[PDB]
Amino acid sequence: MRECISIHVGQAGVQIGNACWELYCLEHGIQPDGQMPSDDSFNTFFSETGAGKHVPRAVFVDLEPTVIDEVRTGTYRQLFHPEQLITGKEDAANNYARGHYTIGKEIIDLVLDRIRKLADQCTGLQGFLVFHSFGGGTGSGFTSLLMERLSVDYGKKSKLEFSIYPAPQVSTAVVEPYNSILTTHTTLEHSDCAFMVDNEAIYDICRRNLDIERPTYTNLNRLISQIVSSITASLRFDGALNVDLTEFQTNLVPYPRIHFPLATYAPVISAEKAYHEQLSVAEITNACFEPANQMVKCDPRHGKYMACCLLYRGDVVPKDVNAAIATIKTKRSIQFVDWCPTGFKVGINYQPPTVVPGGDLAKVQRAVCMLSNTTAIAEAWARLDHKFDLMYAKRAFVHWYVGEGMEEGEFSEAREDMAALEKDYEEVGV
């Protein structure tokens, strides 16, 4: 009961997955061979077979072999079922249309057959946790092919989606704006709560809080997994105020399309800093309202908040939480909408945050993940549609998308649908 099917797509989604499953195995005490030495706390994330082997409720999908062949060879080769690590032959080439129309069109009915064989083991499936890059060809095009199928096949089930989204300055591709804009139909129509994350924001969090001068991606993926462990903690553990995955959405989402919250986590801190400050509930609550800790490069003070889910975990008590959010309501720099006088959903879970033993991040008695619907996020969209406009005015790479079976008009129809989302997040702030 309370199962989640976790679907990891492209290189970004698979490598965040290889950090998520590194965490969940430590947090439930499962060995990297899937065995458990010595309560059903693992049941959300792992199916148990009669040998005493816990097999993860996850699908890994990539259109090329390289990243999943590394999962099939590294320390987790014995964790996963061998046919739910799914590879094609041909890379999607950072082209949405290869992911959606031409290459991913061959693998999709093998991917959905594995998701069906997972869902048939779930006794009370709670939702999908979908992990991807907005800038990738597999990330945008295959996730958008998959979600369209899952939204007719599992129409009632909540689809939570964790997206690495293009930055203000940092970028890895020229066509990252095209793939991201083409994805905006997926998140609007075939998703229920979409967590945008930014590489440049997490790099700055790493520089300021973790004292690490030059991080890899493995440093980011240990922060993106710490957030999903904190979202799902109420599904897995005992708490004072456990939050259901639909209870979460009923407080986060004010209007059907207004489901793009920010997320942040506290305390992100180096183990050397964590001795010289006390890290009380009020300190870590106030840390979530700093622009310095937001994992998208936009300023929350240029918006209004609509709703917050303060998802506390570890040694946290409801007294201290009420006393903390009363100070957040006292501060005039943190502005809410006139129509949400309540503001805060609170969750409080008794399980401390798990340290990954190779990690940059301290042992702490308390953490909070704050997931936060705010008008400010529209600036991250108003950044990227201005990158799209400069290139699409020249038609600057469009022949590679048209050459792989896409209609040219889908670029106009995607920039149009993004302007209608960027309108809605401005329209509710009044």
Partner: protein, 426 residues
């Protein structure tokens, strides 16, 4: 899994090719016999990208060797790695191309292409999933320029959706060994602009400038030039042979690199490069790897990128390095040099990062630049062609092979059309 078929044409193409096979055999840990002797499982994981597995655990490279003379086959077969190639894949004539493009394309190689193409089929049918063709040749002389572009045309017609990826050594005014290179090159660029998906434009004048003003070689040979070319050939395919933090297939390069279909003529480069007497004083770190990689002195075509703007650059890094540090440096470069990148593309740099640096390096970068300055290479070839053609000089050697003055007029027309398209975006 993403197989490449490699093809070598003429003296230059077989020489940069026969050095390339020594470089990628060192990477993959393959002995001059064809046997594996490497350290690591990662060397053997993607050996199929460039080799066929054969009996006794011998690995035979998926190379076709093409010439109109036996003497370069004899020089390769007797060479440092010559015994590794399949005897059936040496396809050759007896009488050479005479440095004549029309002997290559219409007579001497038109006879031989039926015997080449049916070997390209045996290798491509032995592939599990072919990604593309990797052809090494020169645009001066007759074999590489005229037979190699005949062969590009035949493989393009037969495999229309696979990547056609060519490494093309091409003429320059101050380092020329032949009278009719402007003719041979102009007739050859007319085939590359239509058929290839990528063409990596390389110059002996720029390869000597790296040897003299960076490596400080006192007497650089063609063997030293072939070593600079083959380092960048090994570089661009790295992400389909080794694991990485950002993987980029040759197609993931092309989609980012080629804004408009015909603007696929690239200027390659490599880092680190040092004299052997100064490797002791450098720090190989990504900022220093970057400051060399974007230096007008480091690039393997004589076009100074300060005479144009980049459309796209791709920096394919190799080694254990930070993604923040790589993303920081590729930002700092195009903001501090913003007058040298086109402002209608909002990020001009593609990055890729492989976990496995070249044997004996801690880090490497292979640079690919698509720049409006490449027009200066096609402009100077066209200006040399024009002087010879305005007086029909040497044209009885081409028209005696059944060619027309109309084909010369149409080739130089298409050359100025390629120049005009790069100049348009400058």
């Amino acid at each position: 899994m993403r197989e490449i078929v490699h093809i070598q044409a003429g003296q230059c193409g077989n020489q940069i090719g026969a050095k390339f096979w020594e470089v990628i055999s060192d990477e993959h840990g393959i002995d001059p016999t064809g046997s594996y002797h490497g350290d690591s499982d990662l060397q053997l994981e993607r050996i199929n990208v460039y080799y066929n597995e054969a009996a006794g655990n011998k690995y035979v490279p998926r190379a076709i060797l093409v010439d109109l003379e036996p003497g370069t086959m004899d020089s390769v077969r007797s060479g440092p790695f010559g015994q590794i190639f399949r005897p059936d894949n040496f396809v050759f004539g007896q009488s050479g191309a005479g440095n004549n493009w029309a002997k290559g394309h219409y007579t001497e190689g038109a006879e031989l292409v039926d015997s080449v193409l049916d070997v390209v089929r045996k290798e491509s049918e032995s592939c599990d999933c072919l990604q593309g063709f990797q052809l090494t040749h020169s645009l001066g002389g007759g074999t590489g320029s005229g037979m190699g572009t005949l062969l590009i045309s035949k493989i393009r017609e037969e495999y229309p959706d696979r990547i056609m990826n060519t490494f093309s050594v091409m003429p320059s005014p101050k380092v020329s060994d032949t009278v009719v290179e402007p003719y041979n090159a102009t007739l050859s660029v007319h085939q590359l602009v239509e058929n290839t998906d990528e063409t990596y434009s390389i110059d002996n004048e720029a390869l000597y400038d790296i040897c003299f003003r960076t490596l400080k070689l006192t007497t650089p040979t063609y063997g030293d030039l072939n070593h600079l070319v083959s380092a960048t050939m090994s570089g661009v395919t790295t992400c389909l042979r080794f694991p990485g933090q950002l993987n980029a297939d040759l197609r993931k390069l092309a989609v980012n690199m080629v804004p408009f279909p015909r603007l696929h003529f690239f200027m390659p480069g490599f880092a680190p490069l040092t004299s052997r007497g100064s490797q002791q004083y450098r720090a190989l770190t990504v900022p220093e790897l970057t400051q060399q990689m974007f230096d007008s002195k480091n690039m393997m075509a004589a076009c100074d990128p300060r005479h144009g703007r980049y459309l796209t650059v791709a920096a394919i890094f190799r080694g254990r390095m930070s993604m923040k540090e790589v993303d920081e440096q590729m930002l700092n470069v195009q903001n501090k040099n913003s007058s040298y990148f086109v402002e209608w593309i909002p990020n001009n740099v593609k990055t890729a990062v492989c976990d496995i640096p070249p044997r004996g390096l801690k880090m490497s970068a292979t640079f690919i630049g698509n720049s409006t300055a490449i027009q200066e290479l096609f402009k100077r070839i066209s200006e040399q062609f024009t002087a010879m053609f305005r007086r029909k000089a040497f044209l009885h050697w081409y028209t005696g092979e059944g060619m027309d003055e109309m084909e010369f007029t149409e080739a130089e027309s298409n050359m100025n059309d390629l120049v005009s398209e790069y100049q348009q975006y400058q």
